[PDB]
């Protein structure tokens, strides 16, 4: 127990995947879909409705116009009525 | 007077509108409206409220 031997050194055995990998851990891009045809949509754009039924709420963090997810649509009746009494309908 | 409405157009169906208000006041309380014109003589004029 007093030596240590098979000291086994790992020089390229991690090089082997790139150089830039060892001082910074690359990014992940999305999985290309067909119905899609070319779009490339990445992970920090949504410019389109979604919808929150057992989903995640997303955060924002500077600027960049996004969608967001429906809660809640409903139509009614619009009813004649303003900030006041003018409520001439002629 | 809480809220006023007025009606101008030429229509021979019973036509239904609605107004909406916030009731502030609390506690039942009473509600009204008046009609300002005053009622047809003849038979002519059928505005009917």
Known sequence: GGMTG?????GASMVLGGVAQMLAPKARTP??????????????????????????????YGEMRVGSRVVSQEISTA???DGGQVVVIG | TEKDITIKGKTTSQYLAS???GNLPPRPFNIRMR???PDSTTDQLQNKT
């Open chain 2, 35 to 37: 009609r300002m014109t």
């Open chain 1, 31 to 60: 999985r290309i879909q067909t119905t899609d045809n070319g779009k490339q949509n990445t992970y920090f754009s949504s410019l389109d409705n979604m919808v929150a039924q057992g989903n995640v709420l997303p955060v924002l």
């Open chain 2, 19 to 21: 107004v909406v208000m």
């Open chain 1, 6 to 10: 098979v000291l086994f050194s790992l």
């Open chain 1, 79 to 81: 009813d004649e009525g």
